[PDB]
């Protein structure tokens, strides 16, 4: 869409905090990317582990609950790619850990399917429900790869590491 919105989205993806500070206004902090899956700057900064941009955006009114075209919130993006510090920052600023996208995948589904034990533990310690089923009838435990035995034990209810 607009020129300064595309550059803000790109600066968020790239971790270019200085350009974010120069282009970020109240009108643009939650702007959606028309030429993609309609992610906001916080989606990009969260998915690409741009901790300094994530901190800046949240402080300047970025919507921690913003949904992209598929129903993902920034906590989904961070949990999918193992960005523990970003995920902990989003939860600290009110991210709903049991939110589900259009296929009813929660962040715990993402973390369990990608093998992120510490992310799974983080979400469970903030109230994530391991019994939620997605559209395919699968719980987060049902998505755990064979070989991630510590996650299977964790989602079973064993003591965390």
């Amino acid at each position: 869409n607009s020129e300064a919105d595309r550059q803000l989205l790109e600066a968020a993806k790239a971790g270019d905090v200085e350009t974010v500070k120069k282009l970020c206004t109240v009108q643009s902090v939650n702007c959606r990317d028309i030429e993609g899956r309609q992610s906001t700057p916080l989606h990009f900064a969260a998915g690409y582990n741009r901790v300094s941009v994530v901190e800046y955006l949240l402080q300047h009114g970025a919507d921690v609950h913003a949904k992209d075209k598929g129903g993902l919130v920034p906590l989904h993006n961070a949990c999918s790619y193992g960005h523990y510090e970003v995920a902990e920052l989003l939860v600290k600023h009110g991210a709903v850990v049991n939110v589900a996208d259009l296929w009813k995948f929660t962040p715990l589904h993402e973390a369990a399917a990608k093998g992120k034990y510490e992310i799974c533990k983080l979400l469970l310690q903030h109230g994530a429900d391991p019994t939620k089923k997605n559209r395919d009838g699968n719980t987060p435990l049902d998505l755990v790869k064979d070989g991630d035995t510590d996650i299977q034990d964790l989602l079973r209810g064993d003591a965390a590491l």
């Binding site: 998915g47 582990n49 993902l72 193992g82």
Partner: peptide, 10 residues
């Protein structure tokens, strides 16, 4: 359609 992947990278 089919479910995509989130924006991001490791």
């Amino acid at each position: 359609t089919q479910r995509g992947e989130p924006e991001g990278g490791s």
